[PDB]
Design an enzyme around this catalytic site. Structure first.
Site, PDB file in Angstrom:
ATOM      1  N   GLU B  71       0.901  -1.199  -0.005  1.00  0.00           N
ATOM      2  CA  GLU B  71      -0.015  -0.029  -0.007  1.00  0.00           C
ATOM      3  C   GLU B  71       0.978   1.282  -0.001  1.00  0.00           C
ATOM      4  O   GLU B  71       1.671   1.369   0.629  1.00  0.00           O
ATOM      5  CB  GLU B  71      -0.866  -0.081   1.206  1.00  0.00           C
ATOM      6  CG  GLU B  71      -1.465   1.369   1.716  1.00  0.00           C
ATOM      7  CD  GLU B  71      -2.168   1.283   3.180  1.00  0.00           C
ATOM      8  OE1 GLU B  71      -3.375   1.004   3.165  1.00  0.00           O
ATOM      9  OE2 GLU B  71      -1.357   1.489   4.141  1.00  0.00           O
ATOM     10  N   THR B 145       0.608  -8.132   4.728  1.00  0.00           N
ATOM     11  CA  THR B 145       1.979  -7.932   4.200  1.00  0.00           C
ATOM     12  C   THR B 145       3.076  -8.155   5.052  1.00  0.00           C
ATOM     13  O   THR B 145       3.830  -8.994   4.937  1.00  0.00           O
ATOM     14  CB  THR B 145       2.054  -6.370   4.022  1.00  0.00           C
ATOM     15  OG1 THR B 145       1.236  -6.062   2.761  1.00  0.00           O
ATOM     16  CG2 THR B 145       3.523  -6.201   3.301  1.00  0.00           C
ATOM     17  N   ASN B 228       5.634   4.239  18.169  1.00  0.00           N
ATOM     18  CA  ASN B 228       6.518   4.205  17.661  1.00  0.00           C
ATOM     19  C   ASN B 228       7.733   4.834  17.914  1.00  0.00           C
ATOM     20  O   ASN B 228       8.860   4.206  17.886  1.00  0.00           O
ATOM     21  CB  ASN B 228       6.023   5.079  16.123  1.00  0.00           C
ATOM     22  CG  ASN B 228       5.534   3.831  15.168  1.00  0.00           C
ATOM     23  OD1 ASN B 228       6.215   3.419  14.287  1.00  0.00           O
ATOM     24  ND2 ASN B 228       4.093   3.954  15.132  1.00  0.00           N
ATOM     25  N   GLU B 254      27.581 -12.569  16.633  1.00  0.00           N
ATOM     26  CA  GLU B 254      27.501 -12.242  18.045  1.00  0.00           C
ATOM     27  C   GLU B 254      26.197 -12.359  18.673  1.00  0.00           C
ATOM     28  O   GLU B 254      25.997 -12.959  19.882  1.00  0.00           O
ATOM     29  CB  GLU B 254      28.501 -11.034  18.448  1.00  0.00           C
ATOM     30  CG  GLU B 254      30.007 -10.942  18.371  1.00  0.00           C
ATOM     31  CD  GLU B 254      30.600 -10.261  19.270  1.00  0.00           C
ATOM     32  OE1 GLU B 254      30.005 -10.008  20.486  1.00  0.00           O
ATOM     33  OE2 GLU B 254      31.785 -10.129  19.105  1.00  0.00           O
TER      34      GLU B 254
HETATM   35  C1  LIG Z   1      22.209 -21.457  27.719  1.00  0.00           C
HETATM   36  O1  LIG Z   1      22.891 -20.955  26.428  1.00  0.00           O
HETATM   37  C2  LIG Z   1      23.864 -19.992  26.568  1.00  0.00           C
HETATM   38  C3  LIG Z   1      24.777 -19.982  27.645  1.00  0.00           C
HETATM   39  C4  LIG Z   1      25.961 -19.078  27.739  1.00  0.00           C
HETATM   40  C5  LIG Z   1      26.046 -18.203  26.879  1.00  0.00           C
HETATM   41  C6  LIG Z   1      27.141 -17.058  26.910  1.00  0.00           C
HETATM   42  C7  LIG Z   1      28.106 -17.235  25.437  1.00  0.00           C
HETATM   43  N1  LIG Z   1      28.263 -18.698  25.141  1.00  0.00           N
HETATM   44  C8  LIG Z   1      28.438 -18.810  23.927  1.00  0.00           C
HETATM   45  O2  LIG Z   1      28.161 -17.601  23.085  1.00  0.00           O
HETATM   46  C9  LIG Z   1      28.606 -20.033  23.249  1.00  0.00           C
HETATM   47  C10 LIG Z   1      28.986 -19.930  21.967  1.00  0.00           C
HETATM   48  C11 LIG Z   1      29.437 -21.344  21.117  1.00  0.00           C
HETATM   49  C12 LIG Z   1      30.323 -20.835  19.912  1.00  0.00           C
HETATM   50  C13 LIG Z   1      29.974 -21.367  18.412  1.00  0.00           C
HETATM   51  C14 LIG Z   1      30.205 -22.783  18.568  1.00  0.00           C
HETATM   52  C15 LIG Z   1      30.963 -20.789  17.420  1.00  0.00           C
HETATM   53  O3  LIG Z   1      31.208 -21.449  16.200  1.00  0.00           O
HETATM   54  C16 LIG Z   1      30.307 -20.184  16.247  1.00  0.00           C
HETATM   55  C17 LIG Z   1      31.111 -19.093  15.442  1.00  0.00           C
HETATM   56  C18 LIG Z   1      31.082 -17.658  15.806  1.00  0.00           C
HETATM   57  C19 LIG Z   1      31.522 -16.734  14.770  1.00  0.00           C
HETATM   58  C20 LIG Z   1      32.585 -17.249  13.898  1.00  0.00           C
HETATM   59  C21 LIG Z   1      32.808 -18.631  13.555  1.00  0.00           C
HETATM   60  C22 LIG Z   1      32.168 -19.482  14.515  1.00  0.00           C
HETATM   61  O4  LIG Z   1      30.436 -19.244  19.785  1.00  0.00           O
HETATM   62  C23 LIG Z   1      31.466 -18.704  20.087  1.00  0.00           C
HETATM   63  O5  LIG Z   1      32.627 -19.276  20.569  1.00  0.00           O
HETATM   64  C24 LIG Z   1      31.593 -17.348  20.080  1.00  0.00           C
HETATM   65  C25 LIG Z   1      32.049 -16.586  18.909  1.00  0.00           C
HETATM   66  C26 LIG Z   1      32.516 -15.126  18.910  1.00  0.00           C
HETATM   67  C27 LIG Z   1      34.166 -15.266  18.807  1.00  0.00           C
HETATM   68  C28 LIG Z   1      32.081 -14.317  17.744  1.00  0.00           C
HETATM   69  O6  LIG Z   1      32.203 -16.566  21.262  1.00  0.00           O
HETATM   70  C29 LIG Z   1      31.675 -16.570  22.360  1.00  0.00           C
HETATM   71  O7  LIG Z   1      31.051 -17.302  23.062  1.00  0.00           O
HETATM   72  C30 LIG Z   1      31.649 -15.033  23.098  1.00  0.00           C
HETATM   73  C31 LIG Z   1      31.103 -14.069  22.389  1.00  0.00           C
HETATM   74  C32 LIG Z   1      33.285 -14.611  23.313  1.00  0.00           C
HETATM   75  C33 LIG Z   1      31.197 -15.226  24.762  1.00  0.00           C
HETATM   76  N2  LIG Z   1      30.038 -15.875  24.740  1.00  0.00           N
HETATM   77  C34 LIG Z   1      29.496 -16.398  25.575  1.00  0.00           C
HETATM   78  O8  LIG Z   1      29.876 -16.204  26.910  1.00  0.00           O
HETATM   79  C35 LIG Z   1      25.073 -18.105  25.526  1.00  0.00           C
HETATM   80  C36 LIG Z   1      24.199 -19.265  25.733  1.00  0.00           C
HETATM   81 CL1  LIG Z   1      22.848 -19.044  24.319  1.00  0.00          CL
HETATM   82  N1  LIG Z   2       3.822  -0.351  17.324  1.00  0.00           N
HETATM   83  C1  LIG Z   2       3.264  -0.184  16.297  1.00  0.00           C
HETATM   84  N2  LIG Z   2       2.457  -0.989  15.783  1.00  0.00           N
HETATM   85  C2  LIG Z   2       1.714  -0.862  14.647  1.00  0.00           C
HETATM   86  C3  LIG Z   2       2.010   0.391  13.936  1.00  0.00           C
HETATM   87  N3  LIG Z   2       1.189   0.113  12.829  1.00  0.00           N
HETATM   88  C4  LIG Z   2       0.648  -1.004  12.651  1.00  0.00           C
HETATM   89  N4  LIG Z   2       0.992  -1.757  13.822  1.00  0.00           N
HETATM   90  C5  LIG Z   2       0.625  -3.110  14.284  1.00  0.00           C
HETATM   91  O1  LIG Z   2       0.354  -3.714  12.865  1.00  0.00           O
HETATM   92  C6  LIG Z   2      -0.345  -4.830  13.111  1.00  0.00           C
HETATM   93  C7  LIG Z   2      -1.244  -5.108  11.810  1.00  0.00           C
HETATM   94  O2  LIG Z   2      -0.522  -4.820  10.632  1.00  0.00           O
HETATM   95  P1  LIG Z   2      -0.826  -3.525   9.721  1.00  0.00           P
HETATM   96  O3  LIG Z   2      -1.043  -2.448  10.446  1.00  0.00           O
HETATM   97  O4  LIG Z   2      -2.200  -3.862   9.247  1.00  0.00           O
HETATM   98  O5  LIG Z   2       0.381  -3.531   8.535  1.00  0.00           O
HETATM   99  P2  LIG Z   2       0.533  -4.837   7.384  1.00  0.00           P
HETATM  100  O6  LIG Z   2       1.277  -6.070   8.064  1.00  0.00           O
HETATM  101  O7  LIG Z   2       1.086  -4.119   6.126  1.00  0.00           O
HETATM  102  O8  LIG Z   2      -0.915  -5.522   7.034  1.00  0.00           O
HETATM  103  P3  LIG Z   2      -1.627  -4.577   5.606  1.00  0.00           P
HETATM  104  O9  LIG Z   2      -1.715  -3.131   5.570  1.00  0.00           O
HETATM  105  O10 LIG Z   2      -3.126  -5.170   5.648  1.00  0.00           O
HETATM  106  O11 LIG Z   2      -1.157  -5.187   4.288  1.00  0.00           O
HETATM  107  C8  LIG Z   2      -1.477  -4.088  14.212  1.00  0.00           C
HETATM  108  O12 LIG Z   2      -1.735  -5.288  15.028  1.00  0.00           O
HETATM  109  C9  LIG Z   2      -0.565  -3.176  14.726  1.00  0.00           C
HETATM  110  O13 LIG Z   2      -0.432  -3.623  16.079  1.00  0.00           O
HETATM  111  C10 LIG Z   2       2.798   1.229  14.567  1.00  0.00           C
HETATM  112  O14 LIG Z   2       3.029   2.369  13.787  1.00  0.00           O
HETATM  113  N5  LIG Z   2       3.472   1.021  15.694  1.00  0.00           N
END
Ligand SMILES: COc1ccc(C[C@@H]2NC(=O)/C=C/C[C@@H]([C@H](C)[C@H]3O[C@@H]3c3ccccc3)OC(=O)[C@H](CC(C)C)OC(=O)C(C)(C)CNC2=O)cc1Cl
Ligand SMILES: Nc1nc2c(ncn2[C@@H]2O[C@H](COP(=O)(O)OP(=O)(O)OP(=O)(O)O)[C@@H](O)[C@H]2O)c(=O)[nH]1
Ligand SMILES: Nc1nc2c(ncn2[C@@H]2O[C@H](COP(=O)(O)OP(=O)(O)O)[C@@H](O)[C@H]2O)c(=O)[nH]1
Lengths: 430, 438
Positions: B71, B145, B228, B254
């Protein structure tokens, strides 16, 4: 003349290797310029195992510093040991593996393994004779664990008649907050079971325990742990660096210490373990060093050797001590505590005395043991793997790099089979 | 080296994104015509806002934005407003016929006749970027949409940009301001379709924003402008780790690693403490411990659900303004002494605090007060299963007698897709319960 090719992979491997080469060059009387400056001719003998003698008495190490990030190479070059190493032997990629074993074993390790095998072949071609390979790495991270096991497999493919020795640092929850370190640790343990002949299981949990209780540190940094591992790794290779009775030159050490092809995980220890700047207040003699040598609080793997049986021991004593008293104390330890050693391996405790102590200590006692208690370490890492794997946390980062989900279960089954084999050889009696 | 392409699908996405880009230009000091007073002295990119603002040769900071609607109303509203020259007319896509609050119209009939133009504009914006990480899709769960065309776009971006990770800032429907009755149908269908194609979805409901506006800004009739502005503040300080210096959450990877353990459990919850009215600006101040407590207050979240009945997985505390890092640890310790926050039985890390020293900027003339200490708490918890259970309860109520289904089967969809989406959301409820049971 035999010679070991040294490899350091990862941040932990590079930092521990830098501290290790500093302690080794201090023990051998080598400064950072590669010139000998010691006062003993024993240090210059058997120098070819670790230091490559270049022209005009230039002792450069045969270290291949490997990473996937240049920051560790810049940190190594920022220290005094940067000019000591060979600048052509520094290898680093563009981006790190980021604690992903699959990203360090299948994509980035695969793209860097040809360059590191070229450097390995360049070191190997100049050998009069190759003894084996020494690898320092960490099982927790991505580049260290993954590219370490990939380089282990590539070296086993190219040189299957050479021994493979690893200093594998097992990760701990008490020193690193990354969650997937059991995944990398268990997959690397599965590779190290099948593709390595010698492994020194250094545990960061045990180093944190020693630095917490013994060394009285409230916040143990990486420097204190690396000082502990550098002391123990200098003590372990004192049989390789110096001539002696128990020479144990890699293949001889593997023949002595490894009775079964999967039970090759050693439990290193160092009896006068003290923090930096405080080793000058330690009274040193023989029976206190022997009673601290076998202490569970002093041992550098998070295990209780009283709960297991020593399959083979290689106790090496360092300093100016009477070998009669050392042998008397160790036979007293073996006889008075005969329940802690296996009866089906006769005379499994080997004693050596080296007259060159590590610097800062007048007497030292460094111990290598194929104890059965390392199944507690493998049970701990496998139980953390099972707690992180039974509900499939972060498996998409590993299966998104081409790793099958059967490989995790195969690694778990292999480590559980290793634990079962350790328990079987503990429970068996002759 | 890092570049993001913000996509605003639907009326909610377009209006929320327009407020968000207004606050991004306010935070970075970018003039409405596109020039910059301070950081255009260099004249080059990669100054950590080149992730979002591409710099042309004339010094204009054109945003990396694609505004899509079926729209032309709100697109002409942003084409007439104060940033009419900031956005390129090629990237602002209008339509002829709406989706009319129908998922199947925006996914199968009306959205299928415009998807190639939007894909062409996405590829044209991506060809300028050499280090593109992924996309931030701004949409709504309820509309036609914003659900159907967002699901079609997520399928196309997964089959075309499969090495990229796609964030989401979805609008969960609220009965207080609802344009339709079939918002549970569109919400469940777009959640089933964008479960395999979204990597980290920050759903925010208008009921929580409504309650926060009424209880803090003292507006008993909150329009879409106040909602908004508030959601623009929320998303701007969500993205403030990404557009600024590197402490944590500096990349979409990250974001996917710090909060998201499962490919299907990817719904974090944001919480903001200093939501204060502009009249109550000089009444008092706010300490770090009390704003951390209000970030752990269940009435201050961006989702109307209770986190104390579920178990946490992560917490990325994102502090804004001049906050000293000393008393943040004391606030962490006082939170940790409260055993209401109960993590999972793995290695749980903790509250990953990162602090950005840039002060938060509010819109002049807005109802939000200018503050010195601001805090965003991105937390992954099992409390979002309550919101999905509410949605599936309304879905089951309407689908028990198959009400309104003929408006969906008549636009190309199948009858079994409703049961398939219901089974997928039941499986997501089971996954959240299995994480919730230990
Ligand atoms: C209950 O669940 C949780 C418990 C603890 C946490 C804390 C959280 N633990 C994890 O992120 C575990 C990640 C698994 C691996 C995975 C297996 C990597 O292959 C992924 C990869 C990433 C980038 C590039 C290549 C490969 O990611 C990492 O090693 C990331 C990559 C960084 C260097 C970008 O580094 C870290 O971990 C940080 C950012 C230094 C510290 N992170 C944390 O303390 C989060 C959750 Cl959701
Ligand atoms: N926070 C916030 N929510 C919005 C705003 N405008 C629409 N909404 C949310 O949008 C939801 C419905 O989606 P629509 O506003 O109809 O937009 P759409 O996904 O394009 O749907 P169509 O216009 O029919 O194609 C409603 O439940 C509103 O909560 C906004 O300006 N701010
Ligand atoms: N003992 C010890 N362990 C370390 C040190 N540095 C890192 N580690 C451990 O090694 C792992 C890091 O592996 P790393 O080489 O950095 O892999 P990367 O993250 O892919 O670069 C972590 O699990 C740490 O626990 C150190 O200096 N000493």
């Amino acid at each position: 003349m035999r010679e070991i090719v040294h490899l350091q992979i990862g941040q932990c491997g590079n930092q521990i290797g830098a501290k290790f080469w500093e302690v080794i060059s201090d023990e051998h009387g080598i400064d950072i310029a590669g010139n000998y400056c010691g006062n003993a001719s024993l240090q210059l003998e058997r120098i070819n195992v670790y230091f490559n003698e270049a022209y005009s008495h230039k002792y450069v190490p045969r270290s291949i510093l490997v990473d996937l990030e240049p920051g560790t190479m810049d940190s190594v070059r920022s220290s005094k040991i940067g000019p000591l190493f060979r600048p052509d032997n520094f290898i680093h990629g563009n981006s790190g593996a980021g604690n992903n074993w699959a990203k360090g074993h299948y994509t980035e390790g695969a793209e860097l393994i040809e360059n590191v095998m070229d450097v390995v072949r360049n070191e190997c071609e100049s050998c009069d004779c190759l003894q084996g390979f020494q690898l320092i790495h960490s099982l927790g991270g991505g580049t260290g664990s993954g590219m370490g096991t990939l380089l282990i497999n590539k070296i086993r493919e190219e040189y299957p008649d050479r021994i493979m020795n690893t200093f594998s640092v097992v990760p701990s929850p008490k020193v690193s907050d990354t969650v997937v370190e059991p995944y990398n640790a268990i997959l690397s343990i599965h590779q190290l079971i099948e593709n390595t002949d010698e492994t020194f299981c250094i545990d960061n949990e045990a180093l944190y325990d020693i630095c917490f209780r013994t060394l009285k540190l409230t916040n143990p940094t990486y420097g204190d742990l690396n000082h502990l591992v550098s002391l123990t790794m200098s003590g372990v290779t004192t049989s390789l660096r110096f001539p002696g009775q128990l020479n144990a030159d890699l293949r001889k050490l593997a023949v002595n210490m490894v009775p079964f092809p999967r039970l090759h995980f050693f439990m290193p220890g160092f009896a006068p373990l003290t923090a930096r700047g405080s080793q000058q207040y330690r009274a040193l003699s023989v029976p206190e060093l022997t009673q601290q040598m076998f202490d569970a609080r002093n041992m550098m793997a998070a295990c209780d050797p009283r709960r297991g049986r020593y399959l083979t021991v290689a106790c090496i004593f360092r300093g100016r001590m009477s070998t009669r008293e050392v042998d008397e104390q160790l036979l007293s330890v073996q006889t008075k505590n005969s329940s802690y050693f296996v009866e089906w391996i006769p005379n499994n405790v080997k004693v050596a005395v080296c007259d060159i102590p590590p610097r800062g200590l007048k007497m030292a006692a460094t111990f290598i043991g194929n104890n059965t208690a390392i199944q507690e370490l493998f049970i701990r890492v496998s139980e953390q793997f099972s707690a992180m794997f039974r509900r499939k946390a972060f498996l998409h980062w590993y299966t998104g790099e081409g790793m099958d989900e059967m490989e995790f279960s195969e690694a778990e089954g292999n480590t559980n089979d290793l634990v079962s084999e350790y328990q079987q050889y503990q429970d068996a009696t002759a | 080296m890092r570049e993001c392409i913000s996509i605003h699908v639907g009326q909610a996405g377009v209006q929320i994104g327009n407020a968000c880009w207004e606050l991004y230009c306010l935070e970075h000091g970018i003039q409405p015509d596109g020039q910059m007073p301070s950081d255009k002295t260099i004249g080059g990119g990669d100054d950590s806002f080149n992730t979002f603002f591409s710099e042309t040769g004339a010094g204009k900071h054109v945003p990396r934005a694609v505004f899509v609607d079926l729209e032309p109303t709100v697109i002409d509203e942003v084409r007439t407003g104060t940033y009419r020259q900031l956005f390129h007319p090629e990237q602002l896509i209008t339509g002829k016929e709406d989706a009319a609050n129908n998922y199947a119209r925006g996914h199968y009939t009306i959205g299928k006749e415009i998807i190639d133009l939007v894909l062409d504009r996405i590829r044209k914006l991506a060809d300028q970027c050499t280090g593109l990480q992924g996309f931030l899709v701004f949409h709504s769960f309820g509309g036609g949409t914003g659900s159907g065309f967002t699901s079609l776009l997520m399928e196309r971006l997964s089959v075309d940009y499969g090495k990229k990770s796609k964030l989401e800032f979805s609008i969960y429907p609220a009965p207080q301001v609802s344009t339709a009755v079939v918002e549970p149908y569109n919400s469940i269908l777009t959640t089933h379709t964008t479960l395999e194609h979204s990597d980290c979805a920050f759903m925010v409901d208008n009921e929580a924003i409504y309650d926060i506006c009424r209880r803090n800004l003292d507006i008993e009739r909150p329009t879409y402008t106040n909602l908004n502005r508030l959601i623009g503040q929320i998303v701007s300080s969500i993205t403030a780790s990404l557009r600024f210096d590197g402490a944590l959450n500096v990349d979409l990877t990250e974001f996917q690693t710090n909060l998201v353990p499962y490919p299907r459990i990817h719904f974090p919850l944001a919480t903001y403490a200093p939501v204060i009215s502009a009249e109550k600006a000089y009444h008092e101040q706010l300490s770090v411990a009390e704003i951390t407590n209000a970030c752990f207050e269940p009435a201050n979240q961006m989702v109307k659900c209770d986190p104390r009945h579920g178990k946490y997985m992560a917490c990325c505390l994102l502090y804004r303004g001049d906050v000293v890092p000393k008393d943040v640890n004391a606030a962490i310790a006082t939170i940790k002494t409260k055993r209401t926050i109960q993590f999972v039985d793995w290695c749980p890390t903790g509250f990953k605090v990162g602090i950005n020293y840039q002060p938060p900027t509010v819109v002049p003339g807005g109802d939000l007060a200018k503050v010195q200490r601001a805090v965003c708490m991105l937390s992954n918890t099992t409390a979002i299963a309550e919101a999905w259970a509410r949605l599936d309860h309304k879905f089951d109520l309407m689908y028990a007698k198959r009400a309104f289904v003929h408006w969906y089967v008549g636009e190309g969809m199948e009858e079994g897709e409703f049961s398939e989406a219901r089974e997928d959301m039941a499986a997501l409820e089971k996954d959240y319960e299995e994480v919730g049971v230990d």
